[PDB]
Paper text:
To understand [name] rearrangements required for cleavage, we collected a cryo-EM dataset on the [name] binary (enzyme:[name]) complex, which yielded two distinct structures. We resolved both the [name] binary complex and a partial ternary complex in which 6-bps of the R-loop are formed between the [name] and co-purified native nucleic acid (referred as the seed conformation) both at ~3.4 Å resolution. We could clearly resolve the RuvC domain in the seed conformation but not in the binary or post-cleavage states. The PAM-interacting domain is also unresolved in the binary complex, suggesting that it is flexible, yet stabilized upon DNA binding. In its binary complex, REC2 is in a downward-pointing, “closed” conformation, sterically blocking R-loop progression, as well as the placement of the scissile phosphate into the endonuclease domains. Based on the structures reported in this paper, we propose that this inactive state may be linked to the Rec2 domain in its downward-pointing “closed” conformation which requires a change to the open conformation to allow for R-loop propagation. Deletion of this region showed no decrease in DNA targeting activity in vivo but did result in a decrease in the number of colonies for both induced and uninduced samples, showing that deletion of this region increases the toxicity of [name] overexpression. One possible explanation for the increase in toxicity could be that this region may act as an inbuilt ‘brake’ and prevent toxic effects due to promiscuous DNA targeting.
Here, we report the cryo-EM structures of a [name] nuclease (747 amino acids in length) in multiple functional states, revealing a stepwise process of DNA targeting involving a conformational switch in a REC2 domain insertion. To cleave a specific site in dsDNA, Type II CRISPR-Cas nucleases associate with a single guide RNA ([name]), a chimeric CRISPR RNA (crRNA)-trans-activating crRNA (tracrRNA), targeting a region complementary to the first 18-24 nucleotides of the 5ʹ end of the [name], termed the spacer. These nucleases cleave the target and non-target strands using the HNH and RuvC endonuclease domains, respectively. We show that [name] contains an intricately folded [name] that acts as a structural scaffold to anchor flexibly tethered protein domains. Structural comparison of [name] with other Cas9 nucleases and the ancestral IscB reveals a common ribonucleoprotein core furnished with increasingly large protein regulatory domains, which were acquired during evolutionary specialization.
Numbering used by the authors: 43 to 186, 195 to 269, 548 to 655, 672 to 683
The structure:
RNA sequence: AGAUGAGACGCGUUACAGUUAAGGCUCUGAAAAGAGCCUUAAUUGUAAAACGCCUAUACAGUGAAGGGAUAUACGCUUGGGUUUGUCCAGCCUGAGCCUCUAUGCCAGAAAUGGCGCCUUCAUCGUGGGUUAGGACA
């Protein structure tokens, strides 16, 4: 399964793009004349980390009659999109706000309007171009959404009625005004319910125009090295910080902080707990815990068990858990081991 | 009835540094208390998140000029980097080309124009691509 590979790819490329734009903003603000120790630079640079989300303002707008229409998978995916939008907007700002703090900071530093527009360009510049439209190349190009009229021609051609009302049905379905007329003939002649969902799927132009033939005949130890999340390794004790929700009920004794361990124990005692499985977020939130500003549940340092210094490698500041362990040490990771 | 692919916004982890709150230790002081160190949590700032391989004939920015459907490329053909002991997928890209495919944004009923986009020159720098997926050894 390559879905986790795609997720890691996206995180990697997003971090690289953020590196590129921070480097360009750093270079341009140095080229203006004020490098450091001037409060315009710290303000604008700290704004640049959290630049905002104007590109997808109100993403995937949809009406409730459409929410009642699609399949279970698509409506669960749309609920995921709605939850993603709600979760980001509590921590994301729209970019026109971030532009406003950039303007405030740069006006406070008596800069020119051309410099403000140039910083605006650096903030809005797209580095890796959105190249998405023609990506999947499932081909029968060797003969052995842009196909709308051909597709309804394939659907309607099996109806017993004569060709002229087939053309009128085609003209009714390609035009968005005449949908009630399609319901009129669709009540008039009783076909399968698969025919309604299919025909009104071309009427709503989902991704079905690419799964198609050529137009003339429409008629372990392999790749991964180590764990994703860095661990903390200081003076011989190995720990990693966990959120309270993420701590499983069977692992409460592993928390290094004693007082929060007792509070988690009486949290499991006060509320109904499931023995040894992961505990819920809002279920944990009602008990006595300090709240965070942004994500709204605290974090507690936890001890990692079962592994030790025999696998730990150090790439820059981070310390990871090696997945392959001994290959005799692995030659690719042989230079980064701790001992 | 299901799967490959692009671009960000965010969250989370780690390192360093600062601040606040709570706790512990030491010194000083007649005492109130003052100072310093350590632990936990919250908050802020900067940085890292494959190892590596390839690329300076490259990559990126700015300005000017020209083109922009008689056109470009996420396309085709043929090569290359990732690439190894060998072969792929995916991504990125050189040359030719418009045969298939794809062709964004804004104003305008439209014609059309302006942005995005492509090429050249000058200037400024060092930057860019791919790496968590497989199969045979």
């Amino acid at each position: 399964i390559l879905k986790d590979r795609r997720k890691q790819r996206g995180i990697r490329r997003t971090a690289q793009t953020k590196k590129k734009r921070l480097r360009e903003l750093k270079n341009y603000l140095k080229s203006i004349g004020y490098n450091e120790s001037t409060a315009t630079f710290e303000t604008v640079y700290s704004l640049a980390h959290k630049r905002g989300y104007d590109y997808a303002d109100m993403p995937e707008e949809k009406t409730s009659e459409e929410i009642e229409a699609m399949d279970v998978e698509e409506r669960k995916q749309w609920e995921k999109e709605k939850q993603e939008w709600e979760e980001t907007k509590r921590n994301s700002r729209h970019r026109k706000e971030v532009v406003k703090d950039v303007h405030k900071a740069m006006i406070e530093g008596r800069a020119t309007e051309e410099q403000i527009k140039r910083v605006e360009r650096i903030f809005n510049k797209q580095y890796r171009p959105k190249r998405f439209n023609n990506r999947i190349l499932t081909k029968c190009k060797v003969e052995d959404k842009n196909v709308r009229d051909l597709l309804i021609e394939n659907i309607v051609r099996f109806f017993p009625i004569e060709q002229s009302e087939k053309d009128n049905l085609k003209d009714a379905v390609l035009d968005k005004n005449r949908r009630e007329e399609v319901k009129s003939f669709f009540r008039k002649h009783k076909t399968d319910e698969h025919i309604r969902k299919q025909v009104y799927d071309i009427a709503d132009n989902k991704l079905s125009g690419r799964t198609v033939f050529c137009k003339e005949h429409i008629l372990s130890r392999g790749s991964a090295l180590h764990d994703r999340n860095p661990l903390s390794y200081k003076k011989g004790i190995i720990t990693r910080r966990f959120m309270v929700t993420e701590i499983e009920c069977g692992k409460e004794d592993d928390v290094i902080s004693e007082t929060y361990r007792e509070k988690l124990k009486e949290a499991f005692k006060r509320f109904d707990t499931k023995k040894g499985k992961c505990l819920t977020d809002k279920e944990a939130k009602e008990a006595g815990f300090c709240i965070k500003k942004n994500e709204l549940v605290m974090s507690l340092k936890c001890s990692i068990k079962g592994t030790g210094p025999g696998q730990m490698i150090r790439i820059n500041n981070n310390v990871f858990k090696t997945n392959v362990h001994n290959v005799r040490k692995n030659p690719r990771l042989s230079k980064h081991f701790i001992e």
